[model samples]
Target: NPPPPETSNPNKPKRQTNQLQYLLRVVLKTLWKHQFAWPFQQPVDAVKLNLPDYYKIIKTPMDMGTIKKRLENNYYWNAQECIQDFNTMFTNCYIYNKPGDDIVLMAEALEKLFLQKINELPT
Candidate 1:
């Protein structure tokens, strides 16, 4: 037997699923079809994004070489700009690996480029 649906009682907080969970439910397909797409264009493909790992929020030490590789290999580099209503969602997300002192210096320069451009928009 199944339980009945809960009532909308303010005293009881009923749990519900969200898009983040539902998005990851999809399996082994090259790409997902947009049945009902959001108004703005999607910058990063949700299908390919590593929700399992990202959601974990681990603090693993990353090396500079790995960070550099990720920059060239991943979509997060441009995700902040392209995601419709979710800008700045990834500014601090890309780097979890360790960095050499020089990595920070070079990365700061890279950040400044995007910073300057994003600031130009009168948001």
Candidate 2:
């Protein structure tokens, strides 16, 4: 007979080993999708992004400003709109960071604020 199937440990906390990787891929794909469909229909700034030779760098915390800047400059979207979209993505993915009185927290708060704005828009 085959060995018994291993059972999950109910008492142990669940670990999301690929959470960061998954989020990064989703974010990049979403960004690229928007970039390709930008209303202006301009080509992406390959000089700035150096597409086809991009690299990834891991750091202590996410840089919301850089992300916002890239989105704005490349997609020509306003900061509020970018934040709203980011909030929608985060909420849809059930991703959350701990509450804090710091820049990251402030960014998340602003994102939520913009999300409210989006919700208020007429259908």
Candidate 3:
């Protein structure tokens, strides 16, 4: 059987519950799925990610902060939501950084994904 729920003691931080871990994966995949351009010729296996475009956004180009805030203002998210997930994914994300990436890089990647839909989603 699974272990009991973590104690609420602030003095001792616990790992993220499995529930949150699964949610993190799900949200990441969902966002990832939407990141790609549509109308693919081959069926999507729905495995792994096609994130090079996102990754390419950060180099020989601009400050990650500029990209991050741009998407926060436009595509990725605004004030209403996602910082917890953002922090969770990056700032230990309750996983002690397991699956985390550099915050600015990751954010810039996501920002590019959001911007990919600019033709439809608009700037």
Candidate 4:
């Protein structure tokens, strides 16, 4: 008697699995070097930055550094997960800063770059 064969995953190839990761890597690399991304490269330090109420609203504190680490550590299972975090980081900036503020403007510009790069990939 022989044991039953294990069920394989749906027909996606290994390269396909890595494709999402590759896209994330390229986007993060570009963002890290972007001029408008400087402020978002690290997590917001509420106390040091003098935004006492920052932690009160932004429950999930996202940033480029954290996202990169998460990607490296295999915390992200899908492209949408990484995309959501990137959006959250920019959204946090918009929420905490006035629309005309420099950081908010930078966030808007940086997010446009993010979207543009991501959209360049095949659907």
Candidate 5:
């Protein structure tokens, strides 16, 4: 009989199984850019905003509320506005390497992360 099958590659580089890992890093960096960093070198508005300051106490519910209020008052009119924007961006960037399998896994991981982050917040 012929060889059963080719089981492994001796010379090929190990494939990256953590595709989302890299993408997550990129997302975090983008979040920082949008949240903490100044919009311009010169102040665009009378008030100066710092992204790190905005997210400093994100682990606290009170602080999170503050963030929500700030975004609602300053950037977005309401939570729905933010949600709509999120939906648009999410749909645009959503990726699936293995059709249903990888996409489901990535979605589950993201959901878990959201829950974990919320749970870590101070009540």
Candidate 6:
């Protein structure tokens, strides 16, 4: 049986109930499914990776998982902020990893895909 549709509450702020949110979700979904997404799916483990000064250099560490959670919790209010956050993640890769490194190459590839998807969004 079909469940009854609930009425809306005018007092509540509809953060996730918008076209932008849907678009953001779709973009994130695509990124997560990409081959180059593994390294950036979660926050970096400096200790495990043996980069003790990672946090010192990369002050604002960003990742896909964190971004997804932020979007889920309504931390993003607009597309620009979401785009900026994605840039930060890619930029961090460029800054911390060597230009010729595989991770850096992967980051470059993934960033291009991200931009391509973001371009699909309405202005």
Q: Residues 50-97, candidate 3, lDDT per residue (tens digit)?
A: 534432332222222322333333332232223332432233221322
RMSD of each: 16.3, 17.1, 15.7, 10.7, 22.8, 9.4
Backbone-clash count (model 2)? 0
Residue pairs of candidate 3 with colliding backbone atoms: 88-93
Model 2, runs deviating above 4 Å: 1-85, 88-98
lDDT, candidate 6, 82-116, per-residue tens: 78888998998899878899999899898888778
Best by lDDT: 6
Best by TM-score: 6
Q: Which ten residues in a row have the lowest lDDT in candidate 5?
A: 38-47
TM-score of candidate 2 against the unseen true structure = 0.25
Clash pairs, model 5 backbone: 35-51, 36-51
Q: List ranges where model 4 is wrong by over 4 Å.
A: 1-16
**TM-score per model over all chains:** 0.24, 0.25, 0.21, 0.79, 0.26, 0.81
Clashes of each: 4, 0, 1, 0, 2, 0
State how far residue 91 of model 3 sits from its true place (Å). 16
Lowest summed-lDDT stretch of 10 residues in model 4?
1-10
lDDT of candidate 4 vs native? Answer: 0.72
List model 1 lDDT by residue over 33-118, tens digit each. Answer: 23222211223222365434432453322222222233233322232312221223223333532455443444444445434444
Q: Distance (Å) between predicted and true CA of 69, model 2?
A: 8.5
Q: For model 6, what is the alpha-carbon lDDT of residue 95?
A: 92
Q: Is candidate 5 or candidate 6 better by TM-score?
A: 6
Ranking of models by TM-score: 6, 4, 5, 2, 1, 3
